[model samples]
Target: MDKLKSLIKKEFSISFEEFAVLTYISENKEKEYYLKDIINHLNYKQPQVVKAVKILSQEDYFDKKRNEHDERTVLILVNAQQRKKIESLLSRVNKRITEANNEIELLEHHHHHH
Candidate 1:
């Protein structure tokens, strides 16, 4: 986590919170998430959510496409650049998760095999 955060911070100059939002968008490459959806998923308040979204959008980490039904509503999508960045971060996350799973399996194997 530390190394990934340092890498992202060096590249984007943004905090981890901002990276979280951008990563969420990047992971959802197919679906279009509404602002409310992001807020709900992250449990971020209005001001913080607004700030994070605004910052990421400004940095081109998030692409905002207007909704057809409502001009006031915007759907957030991840662009190609952000997707590549997320792929790198996700690789680290997956590695950590794999290690954790291996540890758990080792413990379980010892307990059961004994």
Candidate 2:
């Protein structure tokens, strides 16, 4: 995930934590998640999740809205425009990692034979 974070940071000028939160929201757009859910799901501290959410919200990458069922609860969601870009970046990162792993295996096989 390092490469993914690097690419996202370079392209979006956001930290890995922020990227992660946004990516999670984008991938799980079908489901609604609260602040505490994000903190637990991402395995990040409350402060970290809060900071990321604030940044993403300010950047217009995410939307924070009141839960329909519970006005007291808030839900976080990825903005439609940003979701496509996040998915594209994730796909590119996956492809890069796959290629890197293949090269590593090829080199290891060559070394063993030699």
Candidate 3:
């Protein structure tokens, strides 16, 4: 169980929380997500989002801006150059883990007559 997390994290040099944010953006890259919207939609904590965004900004993964329409709210956008990079890394095992981690389980079966 723990090994799986380590394998994914170490392979990408990214933490689980980092991937959480990256996955959110990768899944919905068509529009801008306001700062609050992230927490609202992801049903995650505000502090964690703040931390992820800060890391993303430093790594050039996300770009933040003030909403032109709202003028007060901040928006979080994925860096265009890195969208595909996010996709490539987020999908292979992400699809299986995102929905199935702990809550769901799967396994292969085989039988033989000797």
Judged by TM-score, which candidate is best? 3
What is residue 2's positional error in candidate 3, in angstroms? 4.1
lDDT-based ranking: 2, 3, 1
When summed lDDT is taken over every stretch of 10 residues in candidate 1, the lowest stretch is: 3-12
Clashing residue pairs found in predicted model 2: none
Sliding window of 10 residues with minimal summed lDDT for model 3? 103-112
Model 2 Cα lDDT, one tens digit per residue, 1-114: 576567556765677787678667766775356876778889778898888889878877657898778797778765566677667656765676577678878888885742
Comparison by TM-score, 1 against 2, better one? 2
Q: What are the runs in model 1 whose C-alpha is more than 4 Å off?
A: 1-11, 26-31, 89-114
Candidate achieving the largest lDDT? 2
State the local distance difference test value for candidate 1: 0.70
Tell how far residue 72 is off in model 2, in angstroms.
Answer: 4.5
What are the lDDT scores of the predictions, listed in order? 0.70, 0.72, 0.71
- The alpha-carbon deviation from the true structure for residue 37 of candidate 1, after best TM-score superposition, in angstroms, is 0.7
What is the Cα-based lDDT of residue 75 in candidate 2? 83
Model 2 scores what on Cα lDDT? 0.72
- Name the lDDT value of residue 32 in candidate 3: 60
Clashes of 3: 0
